[PDB]
Amino acid sequence: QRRMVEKRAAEWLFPLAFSKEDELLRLHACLAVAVLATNKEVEREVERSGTLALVEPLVASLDPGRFARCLVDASDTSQGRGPDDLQRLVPLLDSNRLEAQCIGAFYLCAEAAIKSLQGKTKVFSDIGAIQSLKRLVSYSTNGTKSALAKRALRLLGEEVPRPILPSVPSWKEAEVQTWLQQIGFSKYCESFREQQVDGDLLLRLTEEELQTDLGMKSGITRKRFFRELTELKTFANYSTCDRSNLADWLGSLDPRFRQYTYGLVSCGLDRSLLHRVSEQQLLEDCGIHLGVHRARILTAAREMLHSPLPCTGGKPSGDTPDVFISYRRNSGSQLASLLKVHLQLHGFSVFIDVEKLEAGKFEDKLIQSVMGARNFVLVLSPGALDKCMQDHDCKDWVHKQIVTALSCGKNIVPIIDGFEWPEPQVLPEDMQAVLTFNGIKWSHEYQEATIEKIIRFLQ
Amino acid sequence: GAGTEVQDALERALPELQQALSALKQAGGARAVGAGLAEVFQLVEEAWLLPAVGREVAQGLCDAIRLDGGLDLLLRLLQAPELETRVQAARLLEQILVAENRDRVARIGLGVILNLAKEREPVELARSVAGILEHMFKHSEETCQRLVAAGGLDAVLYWCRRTDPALLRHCALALGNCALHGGQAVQRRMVEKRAAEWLFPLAFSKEDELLRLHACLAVAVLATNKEVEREVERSGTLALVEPLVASLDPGRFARCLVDASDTSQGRGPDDLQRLVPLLDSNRLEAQCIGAFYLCAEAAIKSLQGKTKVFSDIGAIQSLKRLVSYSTNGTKSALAKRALRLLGEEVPRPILPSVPSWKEAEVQTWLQQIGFSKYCESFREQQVDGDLLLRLTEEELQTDLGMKSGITRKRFFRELTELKTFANYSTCD
Amino acid sequence: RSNLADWLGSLDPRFRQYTYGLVSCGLDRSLLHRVSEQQLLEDCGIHLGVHRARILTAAREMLHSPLPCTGGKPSGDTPDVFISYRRNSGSQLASLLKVHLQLHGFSVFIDVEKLEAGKFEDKLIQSVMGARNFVLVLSPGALDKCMQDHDCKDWVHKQIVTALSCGKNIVPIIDGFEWPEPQVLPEDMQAVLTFNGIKWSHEYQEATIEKIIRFLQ
Ligand SMILES: NC(=O)c1ccc[n+]([C@@H]2O[C@H](COP(=O)([O-])OP(=O)(O)OC[C@H]3O[C@H](n4cnc5c(N)ncnc54)[C@H](O)[C@@H]3O)[C@@H](O)[C@H]2O)c1
Ligand SMILES: NC(=O)c1ccc[n+]([C@@H]2O[C@H](COP(=O)([O-])OP(=O)(O)OC[C@H]3O[C@H](n4cnc5c(N)ncnc54)[C@H](O)[C@@H]3O)[C@@H](O)[C@H]2O)c1
């Protein structure tokens, strides 16, 4: 394999995988690249050829049964493969290359058709195929891969597993019984039920708990369990617990470190605290057993401190709003909300009248907010100044807000959107002055352009 | 019988479908196409709005569409430069995207959809494009990541500045599904694309009460993600969640569900297990919107008789822990209503001053956190609350008889919750 | 991934048996210089102290002389060459060009996509604008669907036009191609014919390729 790669074999499989003439020539030239890519040492040169690119698209294109009909309906490769050529496709299903797991599941599907027609599906059990297809289904994140692996598991009459919900921290006791049944510990279901292991209790299981409490006597069985578990821990969504994406820092050291996320975030370490953790703590608290791993996590931690030092941050504490959106509670609601977003996106602290009440503390905090905000945006919607008309009792909130704004000499910008201009005299004198200000017309279509115009006006 | 009812309806529906398929073989300029599209559209609409057993009829109907020209027919028609035909096909697709038909579209032609999405102008179209998107984001993380990477989220985030009732109802139900189904990676992106800020105009709606309810599940689900929590907060959309949940009535949005044809039985056992991790967040906003939804569902599911869901999901134990340690009226109101509708024993709130508890307050809290098996031993040994805040593993193991080290880990977790709620005014 | 098995065997043939134990802790050749004896013992499972001490000693000599330093791969997203071809006909010759040129160290952009649809004239067009050279497989019927395509719908058409517009180095590869009349092509792409074509020898592939390389920038 090293030599084939050094002789540029991947690069020369390109003209055969990119064939437009034969569909078998591409299928055959794709088992070739997919097998080479399974070799970790030549993986990165096989990738650089850009031949692996073509694998997944193609497996998608084709149909299993049809290349099983180019086999069983043909004289050549009648029974397809035999029990020793089949046990060379099973280590494809178990690579970390999607390209290889797809081409692998395509071939195993085709064979599962043939071998079911005949009646020899016992192969697939001894090869160890069935348990490997039901683990491309459980943890798959690709449609092609799972399509084929489900077709296969059906053709060989097995129970097609359901995909595992990824957010393990959140699992209850029933999601744990399910995952135990899909990784073939269905014998320890009763004891995981008696003790009510849910998913925070599972991501935290120790050898002693496994041994004593769950009754996994064998130390080989425990080693087999903790291997399944380390797969799940690596697939898991930790969005609920991780706040610093420690899971992606741990995975950037080394993909098999991502399994230590929960243990580290359940001690409330984060990226900003890792630089001060000690080896004994990585061992005793966070549960990282391999010293070799402990020492890498640790070393990299002290390099954050050096170059990517997580320094103190700061968020806008300016309680003072920049803009105050005044609007007819019923009519202008829409336009006001839109203004809020646009302006907020352009970095303007916006005060809208979130309150639906328009009551309680009558003209209280809202009025202080006006006095607080440099700019005063006025959604002139249809009927905006209708209840302001001859409201010399200064009861209308819009009224009060306008008056307050005028009184402070605030920058007022009205947003003409349906508004029929009324006669000054129909409004109380204290608010007639609102009409002197130039209104901006809102374009329901050219929202962005309109907004730029509005921003020109603000202070 | 039930089966027969379904069959007999289909015995007319299936033939009728085959006829519209003929009009969909006849390539009119906009004629035989437009008509034919509209024909089958109406034929499936009837089956969806069937007030009897109609879900099953329309399931059968949509299946047959897939097994007879598929969605491929419509997906080609979705490219047809005739606006009318594009529009009529959009309408049809939106209403037939069931599970199996969504798997197909995901494979065969998601790239068609993401090209239709670039067109944002005809509102009759946009309505349905946005509608397709809604059901497509409900597919798988892969499909989500694909609809986000190509501008499919960017379309539902532009149609939030629009005004059409149904368009917006589609746009919010969509960011809903996308946060709920997209995974860690998609959630970060939605937040980075300012999705929280664009749910503001939908949660602050004065026109529709469902549009706000739907735009609030969207923010409340995003805020549950600890990594994007602080940016979701900065939008000021979470502000609106709690006020609104208060406003509304559970039963009434269960009557906008069970008294309606759409979402008849509300949610199924897998859409329900996505509301339970809301009850368990640390966000009040999320625990409220979560308990609102679970209340509405507890009404529906009690009417029917399927309340066994709530036990396996793990809802019941989570509502009786929003009741025990709650410090908010809204939250507890809903969580008590629910626990009643599902005929459980509504717990009493725990008195917070634990140091001062006697032996009876400890027996009560043991019964509410489901250690009611260790009540006798906590009584024999007269654990009161200074003795409880001080329990050690050895005391738990030897003296109380909590043999299992997993049971002790489960106990000390409940205990660490109580210790965090406790009033310590007497000692501190 | 690092052939630790052949480093361990070069110390001493009976060390090769420790490969799996060392690579299941995700040591590799580039990390061995920092491992400790207790870790060789507890993690990697090497029992004989005498062995531990040799593996260890040799490890710290990598650090010295065969120090595994930081590497670097081509991050030049910019392609050097863009292979434009008739999706059905030129496929073969295009693929061949891709390999030959890639072997001679030219970032090659072929139209891997089988679709010729989806995002119509989108990323592919940016790729043209990105790549210094524009190689054109003139296969039989290459410019036939480009003929009077004033609607600029043909991708080949668009690609050529984009290439001309940017003033890209265009090199056509004559392989079956009957030269058409300029007037039969849209004016925006008639200029393609002004460029000297290179004849492809299905036999003398290497020689042909050297000729092609002379032309590239
Ligand atoms: N129809 C044809 O033209 C045809 C048919 C088969 C092979 N051949 C020729 O036959 C020659 C012999 O090579 P081969 O294919 O026998 O080598 P091989 O036995 O090493 O090839 C592996 C074979 O295992 C499979 N297999 C399934 N059940 C089997 C069984 N019971 N016993 C043995 N194999 C079984 C297939 O038959 C497959 O060909 C090849 O050189 C080839 O050119 C041609
Ligand atoms: N009356 C109507 O107009 C109407 C009714 C329902 C859906 N639809 C259309 O139907 C299409 C199909 O989408 P969908 O809603 O079937 O997708 P889906 O099955 O992924 O949606 C989840 C569904 O689970 C719930 N559920 C409760 N019990 C269920 C059961 N026994 N089986 C399945 N689901 C159960 C609800 O029915 C809810 O709709 C949608 O595109 C939509 O436009 C319209």
Numbering used by the authors:
A (entry chain B): 242 to 700
B (entry chain A): 56 to 483
C (entry chain C): 484 to 700
Wording from the paper:
The domain composition of SARM1 includes an N-terminal peptide, an ARM-repeats region, two SAM, and one TIR domain, which mediate mitochondria targeting, auto-inhibition, oligomerization, and NADase activity, respectively. Subsequently, studies have demonstrated that SARM1 is also a key part of a highly conserved axonal death pathway that is activated by nerve injury. Here, we present structural data and complementary biochemical assays to show that SARM1 is kept inactive through a ‘substrate inhibition’ mechanism, where the high concentration of NAD+ stabilizes the tightly packed, inhibited conformation of the protein.
Cryo-EM images show that adding 5 mM NAD+ to hSARM1 has a dramatic effect: >80% of the particles show the two-ring, compact conformation – in contrast to the <20% found in the absence of NAD+. Following evidence for NAD+ substrate inhibition of hSARM1 by cryo-EM 2D classification and enzymatic assays, we pursued a 3D structure determination of hSARM1 complexed with NAD+ at inhibiting concentrations. hSARM1, supplemented by 5 mM NAD+, was imaged, reconstructed, and refined to 2.7 Å resolution, resulting in an excellent map. The structure was largely identical to the GraFix-ed structure, further substantiating the validity of the latter. Few structural differences can be observed between the NAD+ supplemented density map and that of the GraFix-ed hSARM1. The first difference is a 5 Å shift in the position of the distal part of the TIR domain, and the second is a rearrangement of the secondary structure at the region of the ‘crescent horns’, where the tips of ARM1 and ARM2 touch. In the same region, designated hereafter ‘ARM allosteric site’, an extra-density in the NAD+ supplemented map reveals the binding site of one NAD+ molecule, providing clear atomic details. We hypothesized that NAD+ binding at the ARM allosteric site stabilizes the ARM conformation by interacting with both ARM1 and ARM2, thereby promoting the hSARM1 compact auto-inhibited structure. Indeed, we found that two separate mutations in the ARM1 α5–α6 loop (L152A and R157E) and one in the opposite ARM1–ARM2 loop (R322E) had a dramatic effect on hSARM1 activity, promoting cell death levels comparable to those induced by the ‘delARM’ ‘constitutively active’ construct, which is missing the entire ARM domain. Possibly, the BB loop, which is interacting with a neighboring ARM domain, assumes a conformation that prevents NAD+ entry into the binding cleft.
